Design a protein around this motif. Structure first.
Motif, mmCIF file in Angstrom:
data_model
loop_
_atom_site.group_PDB
_atom_site.id
_atom_site.type_symbol
_atom_site.label_atom_id
_atom_site.label_comp_id
_atom_site.label_asym_id
_atom_site.label_seq_id
_atom_site.Cartn_x
_atom_site.Cartn_y
_atom_site.Cartn_z
ATOM 1 N N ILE A 1 0.773 -0.899 -0.427
ATOM 2 C CA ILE A 1 0.024 0.247 -0.375
ATOM 3 C C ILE A 1 1.134 0.994 0.185
ATOM 4 O O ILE A 1 0.681 2.466 -0.766
ATOM 5 N N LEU A 2 1.981 1.219 0.169
ATOM 6 C CA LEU A 2 3.397 2.237 0.530
ATOM 7 C C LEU A 2 4.074 2.024 -1.286
ATOM 8 O O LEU A 2 5.379 2.518 -0.939
ATOM 9 N N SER A 3 3.583 1.004 -1.577
ATOM 10 C CA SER A 3 5.010 1.315 -2.690
ATOM 11 C C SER A 3 3.901 2.538 -3.705
ATOM 12 O O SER A 3 2.950 2.402 -4.055
ATOM 13 N N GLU A 4 5.013 3.729 -4.598
ATOM 14 C CA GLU A 4 3.963 4.686 -4.741
ATOM 15 C C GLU A 4 3.866 4.086 -6.955
ATOM 16 O O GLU A 4 4.921 3.421 -7.171
ATOM 17 N N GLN A 5 3.316 4.404 -6.808
ATOM 18 C CA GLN A 5 2.407 4.001 -7.759
ATOM 19 C C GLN A 5 2.240 3.006 -8.636
ATOM 20 O O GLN A 5 2.435 2.466 -9.591
ATOM 21 N N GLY A 6 2.163 1.964 -7.680
ATOM 22 C CA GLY A 6 2.221 0.440 -7.976
ATOM 23 C C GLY A 6 1.006 -0.136 -8.846
ATOM 24 O O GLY A 6 1.429 -1.069 -9.871
ATOM 25 N N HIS A 7 0.099 0.932 -8.871
ATOM 26 C CA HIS A 7 -1.468 0.591 -9.840
ATOM 27 C C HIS A 7 -0.710 0.918 -11.345
ATOM 28 O O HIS A 7 -0.964 0.157 -12.242
ATOM 29 N N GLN A 8 0.280 1.845 -11.940
ATOM 30 C CA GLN A 8 -0.143 2.248 -12.928
ATOM 31 C C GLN A 8 1.120 1.014 -13.588
ATOM 32 O O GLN A 8 1.380 1.650 -14.361
ATOM 33 N N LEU A 9 2.140 0.709 -12.670
ATOM 34 C CA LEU A 9 3.268 0.454 -13.084
ATOM 35 C C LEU A 9 2.977 -1.453 -13.487
ATOM 36 O O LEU A 9 3.901 -1.864 -14.197
ATOM 37 N N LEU A 10 2.011 -1.704 -12.222
ATOM 38 C CA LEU A 10 1.454 -3.068 -13.224
ATOM 39 C C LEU A 10 0.775 -2.704 -14.006
ATOM 40 O O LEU A 10 0.556 -3.600 -15.142
ATOM 41 N N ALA A 11 -0.582 -1.658 -14.629
ATOM 42 C CA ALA A 11 -0.935 -1.215 -15.597
ATOM 43 C C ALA A 11 -0.482 -1.523 -16.852
ATOM 44 O O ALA A 11 -0.325 -1.381 -18.057
ATOM 45 N N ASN A 12 1.318 -0.521 -16.649
ATOM 46 C CA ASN A 12 2.202 -0.479 -18.148
ATOM 47 C C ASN A 12 2.350 -2.582 -18.834
ATOM 48 O O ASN A 12 2.384 -2.505 -19.287
ATOM 49 N N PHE A 13 2.471 -3.055 -17.565
ATOM 50 C CA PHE A 13 2.864 -4.607 -17.672
ATOM 51 C C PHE A 13 1.315 -5.128 -18.295
ATOM 52 O O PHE A 13 1.427 -6.041 -19.407
ATOM 53 N N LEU A 14 0.365 -4.793 -17.852
ATOM 54 C CA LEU A 14 -1.140 -5.283 -18.111
ATOM 55 C C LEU A 14 -1.886 -4.999 -19.842
ATOM 56 O O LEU A 14 -1.469 -6.251 -20.254
ATOM 57 N N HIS A 15 -1.556 -3.158 -19.929
ATOM 58 C CA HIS A 15 -2.210 -2.938 -21.345
ATOM 59 C C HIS A 15 -0.885 -2.615 -22.452
ATOM 60 O O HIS A 15 -1.337 -2.512 -23.831
ATOM 61 N N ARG A 16 0.290 -2.484 -22.457
ATOM 62 C CA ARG A 16 1.985 -3.143 -23.013
ATOM 63 C C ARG A 16 1.934 -3.276 -24.089
ATOM 64 O O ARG A 16 0.751 -4.290 -23.858
#
Ligand SMILES: N[C@@H](Cc1c[nH]c2ccccc12)C(=O)O
Ligand SMILES: [Cl-]
Ligand SMILES: [Cl-]
Ligand SMILES: [Cl-]
Ligand SMILES: [Cl-]
Ligand SMILES: [Cl-]
Ligand SMILES: [Mg+2]
Ligand SMILES: [Mg+2]
Lengths: 454, 189
Positions: B174-189
């Motif tokens: 929960i304290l890892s910054e931009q965790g969602h967008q980092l994983l979104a990069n892998f997902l939608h890439r």
């Protein structure tokens, strides 16, 4: 035969002390139970709940659950929470949710820490020296609800609410000889023994594959007189929003817990792990310094975040896909003895699950075991000389409507066979100091231990 | 389909990775690393694979190494912590003791804005639960280091030809910054 209709409700005279007033005359009955919000000024201090005279009881000791109804007793080795859910289902009472009556009858009682042995294979080093059920739950088809928000006292029943009202007003509160401690408190550990156990924990932490372990000591004394008199005084001084008094067949549980475990309110899940403590200070402006120090402490933030991540995982395994949030991190909540650091995790319960399944998936709490949870529990069994029993379990209810609320039974005393027990622990991480952590256990329960000395 | 296979290596936090991917709208199948064969993966036809953290070595991580060997260049793969080290090992890399053991500690990491760090702020604060890093000296030539700690430890790797990426931290803490967008990069890439 399935009863979908709301229970009958009678409103009684509003008085702030209504729960203690009515429960006084019930406090000696096995299966009379009180959930009390401690008269606390607190976001989650609203309801007091009173039940007695259950229609069914469940008592779990190790592998065996005994289910007793008026003239039928069954024994089973099945999952105790599966057995509980089956007993709730078979009562055929299925009311709609009511935000003003969160318990509409159903299950209420104790889930002991050692019930966790039914959900996880653990060793058996620690001594079983308290004979009190791993699960002691009544099934109640009525309740008294004291609502401190609406200032309403409600008596509900799925049977005959008039008769229940007559039954309640007909009970009279007997004299009862006052509580007295008849020995001094003694710990199950010397300072030196605590030291050795603390060092063995940090040895396991340094080797990785353990991140945090909750290590506790237990205070014991002898007592005589009425446990209910002790509770009235402890309740006044502790002002703890998850307080409870359970009269069981085997003894009494006096809970002054400030910690909510899991709430399930119309399928909205909330858990509020407490991780982080500093003692309160007498001077009010130095005390505001303490509050900000706990909020900004890098050591206690790290300890807390780890439990937030663990609780997110345990809830997340069974929560609706995409429903898990953390709306509040590192909020400081003041209580008479201590400031606590509290975080809040929310989620949605799937339509296919029961609150009972959520409790199985998360029990016992991350906040009083550690991470990884099963390794933490193995270390606790290895080093704590006795099983925790009722301490660091949960008290709460599973409503016929599907709702649930539970505590963590920190700041909880067990009164059995003229012995009273009170435990205190704290999270141990790589950066913890032997002496400070030992001193922290005393900071948590010193006001409790001292109030009972007369 | 768009099914994501998450290989569970028995981490304390694997269902946090599952929930973050569900928050991004992914269809995720979770399988324990010893409840799955290569033949099974072929039948399931995942669009991508994520290899989860776990308290064991890459050799002890069931089919984790076999999945990297068989599917590298065939399907996008993301390795997290153990998954990242397994990725390094499979191509000839070595894993060694970190400077300091890190258990739920946040550190700033600097990245190059490549791979899962595309479009993310620099530096980035991330949560670490690990005692080992990928040895920089023996890192196969096929990998770029995508992120460094303040003490110059590998925090991320990307394969130079294939969609095959590791991160040494927990993006889903929960304290890892931009965790969602980092994983979104892998997902939608
Ligand atoms: N504080 C809770 C009720 C409550 C008091 N003590 C409890 C112990 C366990 C569970 C719930 C409770 C509420 O306001 O709704
Ligand atoms: Cl069992
Ligand atoms: Cl003792
Ligand atoms: Cl604490
Ligand atoms: Cl405690
Ligand atoms: Cl570089
Ligand atoms: Mg602490
Ligand atoms: Mg059902």
């Amino acid at each position: 035969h399935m009863k979908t209709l709301s229970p009958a409700v009678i409103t009684l005279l509003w008085r702030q002390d209504a729960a203690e007033f009515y429960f006084s005359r019930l406090s000696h009955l096995p299966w009379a139970m009180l959930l009390h919000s401690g008269y606390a000024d607190h976001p989650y201090s609203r309801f007091d709940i009173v039940v007695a005279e259950p229609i069914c009881t469940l008592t779990t000791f190790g592998k065996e659950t005994v289910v007793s109804e008026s003239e039928k007793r069954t024994t089973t080795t099945d999952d105790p929470l599966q057995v509980l859910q089956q007993v709730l289902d078979r009562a055929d009472i299925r009311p709609t949710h009511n935000e003003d009556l969160p318990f509409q009858g159903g299950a209420l009682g104790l889930f002991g820490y050692d019930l966790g042995r039914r959900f996880e294979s653990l060793p058996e080093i620690a001594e079983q020296d308290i004979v009190l059920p791993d699960m002691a739950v009544g099934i109640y088809d009525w309740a008294l609800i004291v609502d401190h928000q609406r200032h309403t006292v409600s008596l509900l029943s799925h049977n005959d609410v008039n008769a229940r009202r007559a039954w309640l007003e007909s009970q009279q509160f007997s004299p009862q000889e006052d509580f007295t401690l008849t020995s001094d408190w003694q710990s199950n550990m010397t300072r030196e023994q605590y030291g050795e156990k603390f060092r063995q924990v940090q040895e396991y932490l340094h080797s990785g594959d353990c991140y945090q372990v909750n290590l506790a000591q237990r205070f014991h004394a002898t007592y005589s007189g009425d446990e209910w008199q002790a509770f009235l005084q402890l309740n006044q001084a502790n002002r703890a929003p998850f307080s409870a008094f359970l009269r069981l067949e085997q003894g009494a549980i006096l809970s002054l817990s400030p910690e909510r475990f899991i709430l399930c309110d119309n399928s909205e899940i909330q858990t509020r792990p407490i991780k982080g403590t500093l003692p309160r200070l007498p001077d009010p402006q130095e005390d505001s310094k303490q509050a900000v120090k706990l909020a900004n402490s890098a050591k206690d933030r790290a300890e807390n975040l780890m439990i937030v991540d663990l609780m997110r995982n345990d809830i997340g395994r069974v929560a609706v896909a995409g429903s898990v949030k953390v709306p509040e991190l590192f909020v400081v909540e003041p209580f008479p003895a201590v400031h606590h650091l509290v975080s809040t995790i929310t989620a949605q319960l799937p339509e296919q699950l029961h609150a009972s399944d959520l409790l199985r998936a998360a029990f016992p709490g991350g906040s009083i075991t550690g991470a990884p949870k099963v390794r933490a529990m193995e270390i606790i069994d290895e080093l704590e000389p006795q099983r925790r029993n009722a301490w660091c379990g949960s008290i709460g209810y599973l409503s016929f409507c599907g709702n649930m609320d539970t505590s963590i039974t920190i700041r909880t005393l067990t009164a059995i066979n003229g012995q009273i027990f009170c435990s205190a622990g704290g999270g141990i991480v790589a950066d913890s100091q032997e002496e400070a952590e030992y001193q922290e256990t005393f900071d948590k329960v010193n006001r409790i231990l001292k109030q009972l000395e007369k | 389909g768009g099914m994501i296979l998450l290989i569970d290596n028995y981490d304390s936090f694997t269902w946090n990775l599952y929930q973050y991917f569900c928050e991004l709208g992914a269809d995720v199948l979770v399988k324990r690393n010893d409840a799955l064969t290569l033949a099974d993966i072929d039948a399931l036809k995942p669009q991508k694979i994520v290899i989860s953290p776990g308290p064991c070595t890459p050799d002890e991580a069931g089919i984790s190494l076999d999945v990297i060997r068989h599917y590298a260049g065939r399907l996008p793969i993301l390795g997290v912590c153990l998954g990242h080290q397994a990725m390094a090992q499979a191509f000839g890399g070595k894993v060694v003791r970190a400077a300091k053991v890190m258990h739920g500690k946040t550190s700033p990491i600097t990245h190059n804005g490549e791979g899962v760090f595309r479009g993310l702020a620099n530096p980035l604060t991330v949560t670490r639960y690990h005692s080992l890093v990928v040895e920089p000296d023996s890192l196969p030539a096929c990998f770029d280091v995508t992120a460094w700690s303040e003490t110059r430890e590998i925090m991320g790797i990307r394969h130079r030809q294939w969609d095959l990426e590791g991160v040494q931290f927990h993006p889903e803490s929960i304290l890892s910054e931009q965790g969602h967008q980092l994983l979104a990069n892998f997902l939608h890439r």
